[PDB]
Amino acid sequence: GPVWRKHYITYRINNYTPDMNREDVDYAIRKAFQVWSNVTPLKFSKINTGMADILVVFARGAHGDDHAFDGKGGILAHAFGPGSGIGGDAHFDEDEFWTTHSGGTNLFLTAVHEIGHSLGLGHSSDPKAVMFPTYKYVDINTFRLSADDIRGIQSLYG
Ligand SMILES: O=C(CNS(=O)(=O)CCc1ccccc1)NO
Ligand SMILES: [Ca+2]
Ligand SMILES: [Ca+2]
Ligand SMILES: [Ca+2]
Ligand SMILES: [Zn+2]
Ligand SMILES: [Zn+2]
Numbered sequence: 001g002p003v004w005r006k007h008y009i010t011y012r013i014n015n016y017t018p019d020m021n022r023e024d025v026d027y028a029i030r031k032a033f034q035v036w037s038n039v040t041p042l043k044f045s046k047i048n049t050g051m052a053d054i055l056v057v058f059a060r061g062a063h064g065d066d067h068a069f070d071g072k073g074g075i076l077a078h079a080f081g082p083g084s085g086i087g088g089d090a091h092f093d094e095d096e097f098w099t100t101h102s103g104g105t106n107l108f109l110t111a112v113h114e115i116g117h118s119l120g121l122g123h124s125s126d127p128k129a130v131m132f133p134t135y136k137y138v139d140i141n142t143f144r145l146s147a148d149d150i151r152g153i154q155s156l157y158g
Contacts (some may be wrong), residue, residue, distance in 0.1 A: 002082040003120045003156050004053070010045050012052035019098040020107065028100065029056060032111035035130075035143075036119060039150055040157040053088050054118050056111075060094040069093040076135055077110050079117035090114040102137045109140060116149070120156045124148050 011033065016025050026046070033044040062068045065086065067078045072095045079090035090111070097104030109130070116131050124131040129148040145153075 001120050001122070002087070004042070004082045004088075007041050008043050008045065009054065010047045010052040011054040011056060012047050012050075014055050014057045017058045017092065017094060017098045017107075019096075019104070020100065024100050025098075025107065028108040029111055032108055032115050035112050035145060036115055036153060039145065039153055040119075042119070042157060054115070055086075055089040057089065057091045058094045058098075059091055063091065065091070067091070069095060071095045072097075076105050077114050079114040081117065082120050088118045090118050101140075105135065106137055106140060109137065109143070110135065112143075116153070119153065121149075121152050124152065 011029070013025065013029060016022055030046070036042060037044055057063070060069055061071075069075060070093070075093060076096050077090065077092045080087050082088055092098065092107070092110065092114070098107045099105065100107070112130050113135075121131055123133045126132060126146060126148040127134070129146040131149055131152060
C-alpha cells in the first residue's frame with residue numbers, strides 16, 4: 001500500500017466537535033500524532049490554513065465521500081491511506097460523543113487508530129493492537145502501542 005515519501009507531514013483540523021473543549025481536541029490530536037512519530041522518522045505539524053497532508057474532519061451521515069457515517073455507535077471514524085487530495089484525511093463521526101476520558105468515545109484513542117490508517121496501516125487481528133478493528137477503551141494516561149502496531153508501522157517507515 002501507499003506511504004508518505006517525506007518526513008515532514010502537516011495536519012489541519014477542519015472543524016471542531018462541540019462535544020469537547022477546543023484545547024482538548026487540539027491536545028488529543030497532537031498526542032495521537034506523537035504516538036506515531038515516537039516510533040518513526042516522521043515529524044507532524046499543525047497548520048491553521050492552506051492544504052495539509054492530513055485533514056481532520058468531524059461530520060455526520062453523508063459527508064461527501066463514499067463512507068457515509070451511520071449515526072451513534074457502529075463506525076466511529078474512518079481515514080484514507082497516504083496520497084494526494086483526500087489521501088491521509090481522517091473523519092470522525094459527529095454522531096458519537098467525543099471525550100478526553102472513558103465516557104462516550106475517547107478521541108485520542110480513536111485518533112491513534114485513524115492516524116495509523118492515514119500513514120498506511122491496515123487492521124490487525126491482534127485484540128491488543130490499537131489497529132485492531134474494535135474500539136476498546138484503555139487508560140489513555142498509560143497508553144502504549146502494542147508490539148504488533150510497532151512492527152506494522154516500522155515495516156512501512158524507518
Ligand atoms: O475501522 C474503522 C471503522 N470501524 S471502527 O470505527 O468502529 C474503528 C474504531 C476504533 C478501532 C480501534 C481503536 C480505536 C477506534 N475506521 O478506521
Ligand atoms: Ca457512528
Ligand atoms: Ca489529504
Ligand atoms: Ca458529537
Ligand atoms: Zn468520510
Ligand atoms: Zn480502522
